[PDB]
């Protein structure tokens, strides 16, 4: 629902590359493969972590908080 911290297979930290992955797609107009290779994800185990991730936390954040401070 949010980007995993580490790649499942090898353990490379991919959780810090998610926000820069979206920038490479929306304002640099790169295709997904070049955006993955630019971030340093050269193993397809790491590439499937970012490429196949679904950001379901954005849908969860549209609901109003139950306990609002």
């Amino acid at each position: 629902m949010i980007v995993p911290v580490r790649c499942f297979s090898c353990g490379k930290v991919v959780g810090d590359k998610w926000e820069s992955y979206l920038n490479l797609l929306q304002e640099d107009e790169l295709d997904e493969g070049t955006a993955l290779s630019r971030l340093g994800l050269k193993r397809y185990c790491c590439r499937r972590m970012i490429l196949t991730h679904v950001d379901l936390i954005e849908k969860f954040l549209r609901y109003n908080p139950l306990e609002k401070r």
């Binding site: 629902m1 949010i2 980007v3 995993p4 911290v5 580490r6 297979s9 090898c10 353990g11 490379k12 930290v13 959780g15 810090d16 590359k17 998610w18 926000e19 820069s20 193993r43 185990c45 936390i57 954005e58 969860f60 954040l61 609901y63 908080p65 139950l66 306990e67 609002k68 401070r69």
Partner: protein
């Protein structure tokens, strides 16, 4: 010196690509396994949640926090919590971080690992700082807050090895190759029409002479000249992964020697 030889092909902040020569297969594989699973590292082990109004579960957040790479350069100065005489944790065996995030903005506030604040006394060591790698300066995206949501928690990070849990592993993926030309015939190459055409040559084939395709099979040849590429998660520098792996394997063998002498004296 006489023994295993190292020729480093490439060196980076988080990658070292080297040729480990004049060494047996078992010791190269043992070094690979020790770097993967046996190097002590600092990682967040226990999370005490005070406030959690996020959309993520407490245990979800705790599992994400365990996988945050923390600085572990001076991890040998830290003690295992099982070997410490304190009740739960202290500065001698743990590093206490805190994380206080509030959604004060109308847009979504991202909670990063740069927001983790060490509140324990480090005693001048070089541990506990979350590792920052990207150019933006933020860390790993821990959570996301909408307006009015709060996340207050306290992490205790203790030293451990990747055999206990993979959050303590600093070794990422370790590339490990030998005999790229298959001159030892350790693989029987599957093929449809031609094995040489259908199997792409590895990048290490430039570092060995190709076979002369008329010479007899060398039955006396053993596996040496390993091409290894260690990648660092960031917790320790990539050279310290290899050095600490050699040290850990040496300490394991020395512990076997010590136990052997202790039961020899009885």
């Amino acid at each position: 010196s006489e023994g295993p030889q190292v020729k480093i092909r490439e060196a980076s902040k988080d990658n070292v690509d080297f040729i480990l020569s004049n060494v047996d297969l078992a010791m190269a594989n043992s070094l690979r396994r020790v770097m993967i699973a046996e190097i002590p590292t600092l990682a967040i082990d226990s999370v005490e949640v005070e406030t959690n109004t996020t959309v993520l579960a407490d245990e979800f957040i705790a599992h994400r926090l365990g996988l945050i790479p923390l600085q572990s350069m001076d991890i040998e100065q830290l003690e295992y919590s099982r070997d410490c005489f304190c009740e739960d944790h202290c500065d001698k065996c743990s590093v206490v971080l805190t994380l206080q995030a509030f959604g004060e903005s109308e847009s979504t506030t991202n909670v990063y690992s740069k927001d983790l604040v060490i509140v324990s006394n480090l005693m001048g060591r070089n541990i506990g700082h979350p590792i920052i790698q990207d150019k933006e300066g933020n860390g790993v995206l821990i959570c996301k807050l909408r307006k009015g949501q709060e996340l207050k928690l306290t992490c205790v990070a203790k030293k451990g090895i990747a055999k206990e849990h993979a959050k303590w592993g600093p070794a990422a993926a370790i590339e490990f190759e030998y005999d790229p030309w298959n001159k030892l015939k350790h693989t029987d190459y599957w093929y449809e029409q031609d094995s040489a055409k259908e199997w792409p040559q590895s990048k290490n084939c430039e570092y060995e002479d190709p076979p002369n395709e008329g010479d007899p099979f060398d039955y006396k040849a053993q596996a040496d000249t390993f091409y290894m590429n260690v990648e660092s998660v960031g917790s320790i520098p990539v050279d310290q992964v290899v050095v600490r792996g050699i040290d850990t394997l040496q300490k394991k063998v020395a512990s076997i020697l010590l136990a052997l002498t202790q039961m020899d004296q009885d």
